Amino acid sequence: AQLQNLVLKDREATPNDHTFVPRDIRDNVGEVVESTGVPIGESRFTISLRKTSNGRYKSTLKLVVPVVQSQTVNGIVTPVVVRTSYVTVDFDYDARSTTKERNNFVGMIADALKADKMLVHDTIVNLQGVY
Amino acid sequence: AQLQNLVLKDREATPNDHTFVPRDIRDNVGEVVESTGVPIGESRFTISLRKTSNGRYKSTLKLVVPVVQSQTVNGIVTPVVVRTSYVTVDFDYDARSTTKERNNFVGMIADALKADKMLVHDTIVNLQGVY
Amino acid sequence: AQLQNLVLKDREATPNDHTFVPRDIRDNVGEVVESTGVPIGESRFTISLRKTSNGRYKSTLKLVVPVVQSQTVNGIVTPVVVRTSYVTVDFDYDARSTTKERNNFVGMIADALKADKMLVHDTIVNLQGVY
Amino acid sequence: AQLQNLVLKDREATPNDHTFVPRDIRDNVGEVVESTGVPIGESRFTISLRKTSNGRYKSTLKLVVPVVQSQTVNGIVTPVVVRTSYVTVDFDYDARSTTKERNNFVGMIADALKADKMLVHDTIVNLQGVY
Amino acid sequence: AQLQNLVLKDREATPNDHTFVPRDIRDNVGEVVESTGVPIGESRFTISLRKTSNGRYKSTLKLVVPVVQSQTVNGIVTPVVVRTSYVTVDFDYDARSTTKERNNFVGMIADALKADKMLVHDTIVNLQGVY
Amino acid sequence: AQLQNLVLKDREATPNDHTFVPRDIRDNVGEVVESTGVPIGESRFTISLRKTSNGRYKSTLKLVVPVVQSQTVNGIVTPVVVRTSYVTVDFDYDARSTTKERNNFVGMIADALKADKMLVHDTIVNLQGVY
Ligand SMILES: [Ca+2]
Ligand SMILES: [Ca+2]
C-alpha cells in the first residue's frame, strides 16, 4: 500500500480512465489527485486506516469531484467550481477478522453500487427513496 | 426504488449470491436481509435518502455482516456471533447535479473498491496503511 | 554588474524573447521589468547580493510574472491582473568557493529545472507530488 | 513524479553528468543524492509540493554540494567538509494557472540562470553587486 | 529504501522462510509483518533511520515474534498469544564512515549471532552466563 | 559460556577473520577485544545476561570498532580515533520460551542483517531512510 497512482473508470458510454496521482501523506492519510491542467477542478481521493484502541480497524475512503464551468465577467474568463459531489466509505473490521471475511465483505458492498442493482441505484443515482 | 430483493456477489473462488430480502421501512430507511434459517447471524443492509434543507441530497448505505460459530456449553450447542464487520457509504450530491454526473461519480468510487486497485485494496482488505 | 537589460525565453512553440529593462535598485536590490508603456501587471525580476556577518555571500533572484487580460467595463477597456506566478531562488556560497565551483553549481541547479528532468518538472510544472 | 534518478550537468569544459539517486522520502520531501558512500560528502537534491492553506500551490527545490578534502594516512582516510554551497528555488502558483503558463514561467527563470545572461551571472557566479 | 517485503530464515531442521509484508510506516518507522489473514499475534519487524543533532546517523531494527497456539473455549477455537520474544539492534554510525566500514561492521556483529559462535550463542540462546 | 576467544568475519572481498580475545569480566559483563596493544584502537565486544525482576531473561551484545589514523614522526607514533561505530543487540525472552524457539528467533533477526536482505541493508549500511 505504497502511495501510488489510482485509476478509476467512470460509467460513460465508453468508460474513461480517471488517473489520480499521489500528492501527499498527512497524519497517515494518503491523497491522490486527478488534475486537469488547472489545479482548481482537481478531484481528490483520500484513504486512511487506523487501529482503534478497542481492537478494531477502521478504513476511510473519501472521493471529491467538483464540476467546473467558465464564468465570464466583464470579459474576464475564469474557470470556477459551480458544484461538488462527495462520497465517504467507512469500513470497520474486527481485529479478529480473517482476510477472506474482509475481502468478501468489500466485494459485496462493492457489488451493491453496481448500476443494475436497482434497489440502490435508483437512489444513489436517480434520487429516489424507498417504498 | 421499491423496497425489493437485493442480491450481492462476494469475492469467493466461484462467487456466491447473497440474497437480501426486504424486511421493513422505518422513517424512510429500507432494510433488506440475507437470513440463513436462524435469524441471528442475519446480515442486514440498509439504504436511505433525504433531501437537506440547504439543497442537497444525501444517501446512506450500511452493510452489516456478522459471523456465527457454534458455542458449546455443558452440552448445550448454541449458535453465536463471534465478530461483526460494518461498512457505511455516504453520498452527498448538489441539488443542481445532473444524472450523468452522479452516475459517473458512483461508478468511479465503485471501481475503487475493485480488488485489483492496489492502493485501496491493500488497505480495506489487507489492513495496510499508506506510505 | 551594472543594472542592465535582461532577456528571458519562453518554452512556447517558438520561444519568445522577454526583454526586461531597468526600473530601479532600492536597498541594493536591482529590479528590471518587462512592460508595455503602462506600469501595471508588468513582469518583474529582481536581483541582489549581500555579504553575511558570518562571512558568507548570499544572492537572491526573484521573478514575478502576472497574467494580464482586458477587463471591459461600460466600454472602458482596462488591462488587469488575473493572477500571478512567483519564484525565488536563493544562492548561499562560501567566501572561499572558487569561480568554477560556483559556476558548476548554478549550472546544475539550472539543468534541474528542465523540460525533460522528469522528477523535477512533473512537480514544479504539473504540481504533482513525489512518491 | 515517482522518486527516481535525476542527472544534472556541469558547466565544466566537457559537461560532467552528476547522477543523483533516490535516498528517500520524508514528510513529503523527496531526496536524491550524488553519493560516494560517506554521507557528509553527499551532494543532495530536495523537492516538495504543498497546497497552501489559502489555495496556492508551492513547490520547493533545494540543492547542496559540499566540497570535501580527504586526507589519507597509512591507508586511513579522514574526510572533512571544507565549504558548502546551497540553493533554494521557491515556486508559488495560482490555483487558476494554466499548465502552459507555469511551464513558461519555469523556463523563463530557468533561462535567467545562465552563462551569457550577464546581469544575473556576474552576481550569482562572480559575486559582484548591482549598481 | 522503499518499504517492501522481507524474508527471514529459521534455524529449523530445514530452514523455513518467514515472509514479512509491509503494514505501514509511522513517524518514519517502517513496519513489515508476517501474518495469516488475522491481525493477531503476527510477528513484526520494524526498521528506522534518523540523523542526530550531533551529526550522527543512527538506525534501529526491532523484531518481535509472538508464539500463538489455539485456545479452545466452549468449542470456540481462537488463536492466542502465549508468549513473545523481543530483540532490538541499534546501529550508530559516524557521518564520515565509508560504505565499506559500515558494511564490514554489520557483517561482524552479524557473524557474532551464530550457531557456532560459542561465547555468544550459549548466552543469547541458552541463557547461560559468562565466566 | 566461559569467556573465550570470539572470531568475527568481514564482508571484505575475501572475508578477514577478526579475532577478539578475552580482556575481562566486570559486573557480569564479558569483554572480548581485537586489540593491537593501544587501548583506543581496540575494537571491543561486550556480552551480558540478566534475569529481569519481573521474570524475563535479557542478554545484551555490544560491538564497537574505532577507526584510527596513526601519524608517525621521526619514529614516534600518534594514534587518533577519527570516528567510531557502535551496535547494541538487545534480546528479551519469556521465562517459558523453548530453547528451539529462542534459537529460531536469533537466527531470524540474524538473517535480517545481510547483504541481500534489501529493505534492511539499504538502511543499516547505505543509510537510506524508509519510504
Ligand atoms: Ca413497496
Ligand atoms: Ca512512498
CSV table of N, CA and C in Angstrom, one decimal, chain C residues 1-12 18 25 30 32 45 47-49 56-57 59 61 63-65 67 83-94 96-97 99-113 117-131, chain D residues 1-4 6-12 18 20 25 32 45 47-49 56-57 59 61 63 65 67 82-94 96-113 117-131:
chain,number,residue,atom,x,y,z
C,1,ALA,N,26.9,42.9,-12.2
C,1,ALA,CA,27.5,44.2,-12.6
C,1,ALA,C,26.5,45.3,-12.6
C,2,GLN,N,26.6,46.2,-13.6
C,2,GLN,CA,25.6,47.4,-13.7
C,2,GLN,C,24.2,46.9,-14.1
C,3,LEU,N,23.2,47.5,-13.5
C,3,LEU,CA,21.9,47.1,-13.8
C,3,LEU,C,21.7,47.4,-15.3
C,4,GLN,N,21.4,46.3,-16.0
C,4,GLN,CA,21.2,46.5,-17.5
C,4,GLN,C,20.0,45.6,-17.9
C,5,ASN,N,19.8,45.5,-19.2
C,5,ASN,CA,18.7,44.7,-19.7
C,5,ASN,C,18.9,43.2,-19.4
C,6,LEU,N,17.8,42.4,-19.5
C,6,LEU,CA,17.9,41.0,-19.2
C,6,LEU,C,16.8,40.4,-20.1
C,7,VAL,N,17.2,39.4,-20.9
C,7,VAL,CA,16.2,38.8,-21.8
C,7,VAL,C,16.0,37.3,-21.4
C,8,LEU,N,14.7,36.9,-21.1
C,8,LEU,CA,14.4,35.6,-20.8
C,8,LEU,C,13.6,34.9,-21.8
C,9,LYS,N,13.8,33.6,-22.0
C,9,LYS,CA,13.0,32.9,-23.0
C,9,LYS,C,11.8,32.1,-22.5
C,10,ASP,N,10.8,31.9,-23.4
C,10,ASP,CA,9.6,31.1,-23.2
C,10,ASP,C,10.0,29.7,-23.3
C,11,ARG,N,8.9,28.9,-23.4
C,11,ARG,CA,9.0,27.5,-23.6
C,11,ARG,C,7.9,27.3,-24.6
C,12,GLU,N,7.5,28.4,-25.2
C,12,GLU,CA,6.4,28.4,-26.2
C,12,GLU,C,6.9,27.7,-27.4
C,18,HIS,N,11.6,37.7,-23.9
C,18,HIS,CA,11.0,38.7,-22.9
C,18,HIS,C,12.1,39.6,-22.5
C,25,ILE,N,16.9,50.4,-8.4
C,25,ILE,CA,17.6,49.5,-7.5
C,25,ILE,C,17.5,50.2,-6.1
C,30,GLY,N,18.5,45.3,-7.3
C,30,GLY,CA,18.2,45.6,-8.7
C,30,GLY,C,16.8,45.1,-9.2
C,32,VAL,N,14.4,44.9,-12.7
C,32,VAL,CA,14.4,45.0,-14.1
C,32,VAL,C,13.0,44.5,-14.5
C,45,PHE,N,11.7,41.2,-12.3
C,45,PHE,CA,12.7,40.3,-12.0
C,45,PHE,C,13.7,41.2,-11.1
C,47,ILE,N,17.2,41.2,-8.5
C,47,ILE,CA,18.4,40.5,-8.2
C,47,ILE,C,19.2,41.3,-7.1
C,48,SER,N,19.8,40.6,-6.2
C,48,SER,CA,20.6,41.2,-5.1
C,48,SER,C,21.7,40.4,-4.6
C,49,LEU,N,22.6,41.0,-3.9
C,49,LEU,CA,23.7,40.3,-3.3
C,49,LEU,C,24.1,40.9,-2.0
C,56,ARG,N,29.6,35.0,4.7
C,56,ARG,CA,29.1,34.3,3.5
C,56,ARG,C,28.5,35.2,2.5
C,57,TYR,N,28.6,34.8,1.2
C,57,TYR,CA,28.0,35.6,0.2
C,57,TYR,C,26.7,35.0,-0.1
C,59,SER,N,23.2,35.7,-2.6
C,59,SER,CA,22.5,36.5,-3.5
C,59,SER,C,21.1,35.9,-3.7
C,61,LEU,N,17.5,35.9,-6.4
C,61,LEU,CA,16.8,36.2,-7.6
C,61,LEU,C,15.3,36.0,-7.3
C,63,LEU,N,11.6,36.3,-9.6
C,63,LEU,CA,10.9,36.6,-10.9
C,63,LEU,C,9.4,36.6,-10.6
C,64,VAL,N,8.7,37.6,-11.1
C,64,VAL,CA,7.3,37.7,-10.9
C,64,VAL,C,6.6,37.9,-12.2
C,65,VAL,N,5.7,37.0,-12.6
C,65,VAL,CA,5.0,37.1,-13.8
C,65,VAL,C,3.5,37.1,-13.7
C,67,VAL,N,-0.4,37.6,-15.0
C,67,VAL,CA,-1.1,37.4,-16.2
C,67,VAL,C,-2.1,38.5,-16.3
C,83,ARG,N,-4.0,36.9,-12.2
C,83,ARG,CA,-3.3,36.1,-11.3
C,83,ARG,C,-1.8,36.2,-11.5
C,84,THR,N,-1.0,35.8,-10.5
C,84,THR,CA,0.4,36.0,-10.6
C,84,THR,C,1.2,34.7,-10.3
C,85,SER,N,2.4,34.6,-10.8
C,85,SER,CA,3.2,33.4,-10.5
C,85,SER,C,4.6,33.9,-10.0
C,86,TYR,N,5.0,33.4,-8.8
C,86,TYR,CA,6.2,33.8,-8.2
C,86,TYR,C,7.2,32.7,-8.0
C,87,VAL,N,8.5,33.2,-8.0
C,87,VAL,CA,9.6,32.2,-7.8
C,87,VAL,C,10.7,33.0,-7.2
C,88,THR,N,11.5,32.3,-6.4
C,88,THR,CA,12.6,32.9,-5.6
C,88,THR,C,13.8,32.0,-5.4
C,89,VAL,N,14.8,32.1,-6.2
C,89,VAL,CA,16.0,31.3,-6.0
C,89,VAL,C,16.9,32.0,-5.0
C,90,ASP,N,17.5,31.2,-4.1
C,90,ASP,CA,18.4,31.7,-3.1
C,90,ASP,C,19.8,31.1,-3.1
C,91,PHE,N,20.8,31.8,-3.5
C,91,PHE,CA,22.1,31.2,-3.5
C,91,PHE,C,22.9,31.6,-2.3
C,92,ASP,N,23.6,30.7,-1.7
C,92,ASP,CA,24.4,31.0,-0.5
C,92,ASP,C,25.7,30.3,-0.7
C,93,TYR,N,26.8,31.0,-1.0
C,93,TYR,CA,28.1,30.5,-1.2
C,93,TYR,C,29.0,30.7,-0.1
C,94,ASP,N,30.1,30.0,-0.1
C,94,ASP,CA,31.1,30.2,1.0
C,94,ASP,C,32.1,31.1,0.5
C,96,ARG,N,35.0,31.1,0.3
C,96,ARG,CA,36.2,30.5,-0.1
C,96,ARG,C,36.0,29.7,-1.4
C,97,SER,N,34.8,29.7,-1.9
C,97,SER,CA,34.4,29.0,-3.1
C,97,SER,C,35.2,29.6,-4.3
C,99,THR,N,35.5,30.3,-8.5
C,99,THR,CA,34.6,30.6,-9.6
C,99,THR,C,34.1,29.4,-10.2
C,100,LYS,N,34.9,28.4,-10.5
C,100,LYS,CA,34.5,27.2,-11.1
C,100,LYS,C,33.4,26.5,-10.2
C,101,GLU,N,33.6,26.3,-9.0
C,101,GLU,CA,32.7,25.6,-8.1
C,101,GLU,C,31.3,26.3,-8.2
C,102,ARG,N,31.3,27.6,-8.0
C,102,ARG,CA,30.1,28.3,-8.1
C,102,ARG,C,29.4,28.2,-9.4
C,103,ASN,N,30.2,28.4,-10.5
C,103,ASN,CA,29.6,28.2,-11.8
C,103,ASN,C,29.0,26.9,-12.0
C,104,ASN,N,29.8,25.8,-11.8
C,104,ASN,CA,29.3,24.5,-11.9
C,104,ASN,C,28.0,24.3,-11.1
C,105,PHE,N,28.0,24.9,-9.9
C,105,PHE,CA,26.8,24.8,-9.0
C,105,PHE,C,25.6,25.2,-9.8
C,106,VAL,N,25.6,26.5,-10.1
C,106,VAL,CA,24.5,27.1,-10.9
C,106,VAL,C,24.1,26.2,-12.0
C,107,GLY,N,25.1,25.9,-12.8
C,107,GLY,CA,24.8,25.1,-14.0
C,107,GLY,C,23.9,23.9,-13.6
C,108,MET,N,24.2,23.2,-12.5
C,108,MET,CA,23.4,22.1,-12.1
C,108,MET,C,22.0,22.4,-11.7
C,109,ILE,N,21.9,23.2,-10.7
C,109,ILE,CA,20.6,23.7,-10.2
C,109,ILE,C,19.8,24.1,-11.5
C,110,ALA,N,20.5,24.7,-12.4
C,110,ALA,CA,19.9,25.2,-13.7
C,110,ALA,C,19.3,24.0,-14.4
C,111,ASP,N,20.2,23.1,-14.8
C,111,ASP,CA,19.9,21.9,-15.5
C,111,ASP,C,18.6,21.2,-14.9
C,112,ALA,N,18.6,21.2,-13.5
C,112,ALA,CA,17.4,20.6,-12.8
C,112,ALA,C,16.1,21.1,-13.3
C,113,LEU,N,16.0,22.4,-13.5
C,113,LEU,CA,14.7,23.0,-13.9
C,113,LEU,C,14.7,22.7,-15.4
C,117,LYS,N,13.8,16.9,-17.3
C,117,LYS,CA,14.2,16.4,-16.0
C,117,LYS,C,12.9,16.0,-15.2
C,118,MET,N,12.5,14.8,-15.6
C,118,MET,CA,11.2,14.2,-15.0
C,118,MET,C,10.9,14.6,-13.6
C,119,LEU,N,11.6,13.9,-12.7
C,119,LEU,CA,11.4,14.1,-11.2
C,119,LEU,C,11.0,15.6,-10.9
C,120,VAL,N,11.8,16.5,-11.4
C,120,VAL,CA,11.5,17.9,-11.1
C,120,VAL,C,10.3,18.5,-11.8
C,121,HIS,N,10.4,18.5,-13.1
C,121,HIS,CA,9.3,19.0,-13.9
C,121,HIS,C,7.9,18.6,-13.5
C,122,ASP,N,7.6,17.4,-13.4
C,122,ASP,CA,6.3,16.8,-13.0
C,122,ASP,C,5.8,17.5,-11.7
C,123,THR,N,6.7,18.1,-11.0
C,123,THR,CA,6.3,18.8,-9.7
C,123,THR,C,6.2,20.3,-9.9
C,124,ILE,N,7.3,20.9,-10.3
C,124,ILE,CA,7.3,22.4,-10.5
C,124,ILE,C,6.4,22.8,-11.6
C,125,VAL,N,6.0,21.9,-12.4
C,125,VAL,CA,5.1,22.3,-13.6
C,125,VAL,C,3.8,21.6,-13.5
C,126,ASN,N,3.7,20.4,-13.2
C,126,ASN,CA,2.4,19.7,-13.2
C,126,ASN,C,1.9,19.7,-11.8
C,127,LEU,N,2.6,20.2,-10.8
C,127,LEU,CA,2.1,20.3,-9.5
C,127,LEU,C,1.7,18.9,-9.0
C,128,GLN,N,2.5,17.9,-9.3
C,128,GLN,CA,2.2,16.6,-8.8
C,128,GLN,C,3.2,16.2,-7.8
C,129,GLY,N,2.8,15.5,-6.7
C,129,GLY,CA,3.7,15.1,-5.7
C,129,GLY,C,4.8,14.1,-6.0
C,130,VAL,N,5.6,13.8,-5.0
C,130,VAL,CA,6.7,12.8,-5.2
C,130,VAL,C,6.3,11.5,-4.4
C,131,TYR,N,6.5,10.4,-5.0
C,131,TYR,CA,6.2,9.1,-4.3
C,131,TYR,C,7.1,7.9,-4.6
D,1,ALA,N,5.3,12.0,-10.7
D,1,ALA,CA,6.7,12.2,-10.3
D,1,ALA,C,7.1,11.2,-9.2
D,2,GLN,N,7.5,10.0,-9.6
D,2,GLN,CA,7.9,9.0,-8.7
D,2,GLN,C,9.4,9.2,-8.4
D,3,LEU,N,9.8,9.2,-7.1
D,3,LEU,CA,11.2,9.4,-6.8
D,3,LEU,C,12.1,8.5,-7.6
D,4,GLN,N,13.0,9.1,-8.4
D,4,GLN,CA,13.8,8.4,-9.3
D,4,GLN,C,15.1,9.1,-9.5
D,6,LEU,N,17.9,11.5,-11.0
D,6,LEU,CA,17.9,12.8,-11.5
D,6,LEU,C,19.4,13.1,-11.9
D,7,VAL,N,19.6,13.5,-13.1
D,7,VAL,CA,21.0,13.7,-13.5
D,7,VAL,C,21.3,15.2,-14.0
D,8,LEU,N,22.2,15.9,-13.3
D,8,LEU,CA,22.5,17.3,-13.6
D,8,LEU,C,23.9,17.5,-14.2
D,9,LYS,N,24.0,18.4,-15.2
D,9,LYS,CA,25.2,18.7,-15.8
D,9,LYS,C,26.0,19.8,-15.3
D,10,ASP,N,27.3,19.8,-15.5
D,10,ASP,CA,28.3,20.9,-15.1
D,10,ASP,C,28.3,21.9,-16.1
D,11,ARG,N,29.2,22.8,-15.9
D,11,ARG,CA,29.5,23.9,-16.9
D,11,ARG,C,31.0,23.7,-17.1
D,12,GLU,N,31.4,22.5,-16.8
D,12,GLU,CA,32.8,22.1,-17.0
D,12,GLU,C,33.0,22.1,-18.5
D,18,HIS,N,26.2,14.5,-13.4
D,18,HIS,CA,26.1,14.2,-12.0
D,18,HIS,C,24.8,13.4,-11.7
D,20,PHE,N,22.3,11.8,-9.5
D,20,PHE,CA,21.7,11.7,-8.1
D,20,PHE,C,20.8,10.5,-8.1
D,25,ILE,N,12.1,9.5,1.0
D,25,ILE,CA,11.0,10.5,1.1
D,25,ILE,C,10.8,10.7,2.5
D,32,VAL,N,17.3,13.1,-3.4
D,32,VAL,CA,18.0,12.4,-4.4
D,32,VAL,C,19.5,12.7,-4.1
D,45,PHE,N,19.8,16.7,-3.4
D,45,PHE,CA,18.8,17.4,-4.1
D,45,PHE,C,17.4,17.1,-3.4
D,47,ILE,N,13.1,18.1,-3.0
D,47,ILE,CA,12.0,18.5,-3.7
D,47,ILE,C,10.6,18.2,-3.0
D,48,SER,N,9.8,19.2,-3.0
D,48,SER,CA,8.5,19.1,-2.3
D,48,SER,C,7.3,19.8,-3.0
D,49,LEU,N,6.1,19.5,-2.6
D,49,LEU,CA,4.9,20.2,-3.1
D,49,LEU,C,3.9,20.3,-2.0
D,56,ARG,N,-3.0,28.2,-2.7
D,56,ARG,CA,-1.9,28.4,-3.7
D,56,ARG,C,-1.2,27.1,-3.8
D,57,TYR,N,-0.3,27.0,-4.8
D,57,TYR,CA,0.5,25.8,-4.9
D,57,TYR,C,1.9,26.2,-4.9
D,59,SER,N,6.0,24.7,-4.5
D,59,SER,CA,6.9,23.5,-4.5
D,59,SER,C,8.3,24.1,-4.3
D,61,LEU,N,12.6,23.4,-4.3
D,61,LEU,CA,13.8,22.7,-4.7
D,61,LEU,C,14.9,23.2,-3.9
D,63,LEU,N,19.3,22.4,-3.5
D,63,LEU,CA,20.4,21.7,-3.9
D,63,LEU,C,21.6,22.0,-3.0
D,65,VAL,N,25.8,21.0,-2.4
D,65,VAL,CA,27.0,20.3,-2.8
D,65,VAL,C,28.2,20.8,-1.9
D,67,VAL,N,32.2,20.6,-0.5
D,67,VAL,CA,33.5,20.4,-1.1
D,67,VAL,C,34.2,19.7,0.1
D,82,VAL,N,35.1,21.2,3.8
D,82,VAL,CA,35.8,22.5,3.9
D,82,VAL,C,35.0,23.7,3.4
D,83,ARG,N,33.9,23.4,2.9
D,83,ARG,CA,33.0,24.5,2.4
D,83,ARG,C,31.8,23.9,1.7
D,84,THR,N,30.6,24.6,1.8
D,84,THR,CA,29.5,24.1,1.1
D,84,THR,C,28.7,25.2,0.3
D,85,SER,N,27.9,24.7,-0.6
D,85,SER,CA,27.1,25.7,-1.4
D,85,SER,C,25.6,25.3,-1.4
D,86,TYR,N,24.7,26.3,-1.3
D,86,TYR,CA,23.3,26.0,-1.2
D,86,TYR,C,22.4,26.8,-2.1
D,87,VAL,N,21.4,26.2,-2.6
D,87,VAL,CA,20.4,26.9,-3.5
D,87,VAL,C,19.0,26.5,-3.1
D,88,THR,N,18.1,27.4,-3.1
D,88,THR,CA,16.7,27.1,-2.8
D,88,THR,C,15.7,27.8,-3.7
D,89,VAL,N,15.2,27.1,-4.7
D,89,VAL,CA,14.3,27.7,-5.6
D,89,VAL,C,12.9,27.5,-5.0
D,90,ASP,N,12.1,28.5,-5.0
D,90,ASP,CA,10.7,28.5,-4.4
D,90,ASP,C,9.6,29.0,-5.3
D,91,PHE,N,8.9,28.0,-5.9
D,91,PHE,CA,7.8,28.4,-6.8
D,91,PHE,C,6.5,28.5,-6.0
D,92,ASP,N,5.7,29.4,-6.5
D,92,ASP,CA,4.4,29.7,-5.9
D,92,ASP,C,3.4,30.1,-6.9
D,93,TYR,N,2.5,29.1,-7.3
D,93,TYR,CA,1.5,29.4,-8.3
D,93,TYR,C,0.0,29.6,-7.9
D,94,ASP,N,-0.8,30.2,-8.8
D,94,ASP,CA,-2.2,30.4,-8.5
D,94,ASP,C,-3.0,29.2,-8.9
D,96,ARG,N,-5.4,28.9,-10.4
D,96,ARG,CA,-6.1,29.0,-11.7
D,96,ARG,C,-5.1,29.1,-12.8
D,97,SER,N,-3.8,28.8,-12.5
D,97,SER,CA,-2.8,28.9,-13.5
D,97,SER,C,-2.9,27.8,-14.5
D,98,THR,N,-2.5,28.0,-15.8
D,98,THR,CA,-2.5,27.0,-16.9
D,98,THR,C,-1.2,26.2,-16.8
D,99,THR,N,-1.3,25.0,-17.3
D,99,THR,CA,-0.1,24.2,-17.3
D,99,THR,C,0.9,25.1,-18.2
D,100,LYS,N,0.5,25.5,-19.3
D,100,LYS,CA,1.3,26.3,-20.2
D,100,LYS,C,1.9,27.4,-19.5
D,101,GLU,N,1.1,28.2,-18.8
D,101,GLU,CA,1.6,29.4,-18.0
D,101,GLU,C,2.8,29.0,-17.1
D,102,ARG,N,2.5,28.0,-16.2
D,102,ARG,CA,3.5,27.6,-15.3
D,102,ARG,C,4.8,27.2,-16.1
D,103,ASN,N,4.7,26.3,-17.0
D,103,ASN,CA,5.8,25.8,-17.8
D,103,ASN,C,6.7,27.0,-18.2
D,104,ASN,N,6.0,27.9,-18.9
D,104,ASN,CA,6.7,29.1,-19.4
D,104,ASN,C,7.4,29.9,-18.3
D,105,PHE,N,6.7,30.0,-17.2
D,105,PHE,CA,7.3,30.7,-16.0
D,105,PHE,C,8.6,30.0,-15.7
D,106,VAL,N,8.6,28.8,-15.4
D,106,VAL,CA,9.8,28.0,-15.1
D,106,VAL,C,10.9,28.3,-16.1
D,107,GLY,N,10.6,28.0,-17.4
D,107,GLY,CA,11.5,28.2,-18.4
D,107,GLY,C,12.2,29.5,-18.5
D,108,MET,N,11.4,30.5,-18.0
D,108,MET,CA,11.9,31.9,-18.0
D,108,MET,C,13.0,32.0,-16.9
D,109,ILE,N,12.6,31.8,-15.7
D,109,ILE,CA,13.6,31.9,-14.6
D,109,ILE,C,14.7,31.0,-14.9
D,110,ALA,N,14.4,29.9,-15.5
D,110,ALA,CA,15.5,28.9,-15.8
D,110,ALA,C,16.5,29.7,-16.7
D,111,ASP,N,16.0,30.2,-17.8
D,111,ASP,CA,16.9,30.9,-18.7
D,111,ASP,C,17.7,32.0,-18.0
D,112,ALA,N,17.1,32.6,-16.9
D,112,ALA,CA,17.8,33.6,-16.2
D,112,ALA,C,19.2,33.2,-15.7
D,113,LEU,N,19.2,32.0,-15.1
D,113,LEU,CA,20.5,31.4,-14.7
D,113,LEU,C,21.2,31.1,-15.9
D,117,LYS,N,23.6,35.3,-19.7
D,117,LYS,CA,22.7,36.3,-19.2
D,117,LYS,C,23.6,37.1,-18.1
D,118,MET,N,24.3,38.1,-18.6
D,118,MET,CA,25.2,38.9,-17.8
D,118,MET,C,24.7,39.4,-16.5
D,119,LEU,N,23.7,40.3,-16.5
D,119,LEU,CA,23.2,40.9,-15.3
D,119,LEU,C,23.2,39.9,-14.1
D,120,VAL,N,22.6,38.7,-14.4
D,120,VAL,CA,22.5,37.7,-13.4
D,120,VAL,C,23.8,37.0,-13.1
D,121,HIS,N,24.5,36.5,-14.1
D,121,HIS,CA,25.7,35.7,-13.9
D,121,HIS,C,26.7,36.5,-13.1
D,122,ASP,N,27.1,37.7,-13.5
D,122,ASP,CA,28.1,38.4,-12.7
D,122,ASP,C,27.8,38.5,-11.2
D,123,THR,N,26.6,38.2,-10.8
D,123,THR,CA,26.2,38.2,-9.5
D,123,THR,C,26.1,36.8,-8.8
D,124,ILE,N,25.4,35.9,-9.4
D,124,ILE,CA,25.2,34.6,-8.8
D,124,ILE,C,26.4,33.7,-9.1
D,125,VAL,N,27.4,34.2,-9.8
D,125,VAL,CA,28.6,33.4,-10.1
D,125,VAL,C,29.9,34.2,-9.7
D,126,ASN,N,29.9,35.4,-10.2
D,126,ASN,CA,31.1,36.2,-9.9
D,126,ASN,C,31.0,37.0,-8.6
D,127,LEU,N,29.8,36.9,-8.0
D,127,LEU,CA,29.6,37.7,-6.8
D,127,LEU,C,29.9,39.1,-6.8
D,128,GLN,N,29.3,39.8,-7.8
D,128,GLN,CA,29.5,41.2,-8.0
D,128,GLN,C,28.2,41.8,-7.5
D,129,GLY,N,28.1,43.0,-7.0
D,129,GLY,CA,26.8,43.6,-6.6
D,129,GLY,C,26.2,44.2,-7.9
D,130,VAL,N,25.1,44.9,-7.6
D,130,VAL,CA,24.4,45.5,-8.7
D,130,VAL,C,24.5,47.0,-8.5
D,131,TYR,N,24.8,47.8,-9.5
D,131,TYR,CA,25.0,49.2,-9.4
D,131,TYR,C,24.5,50.0,-10.6
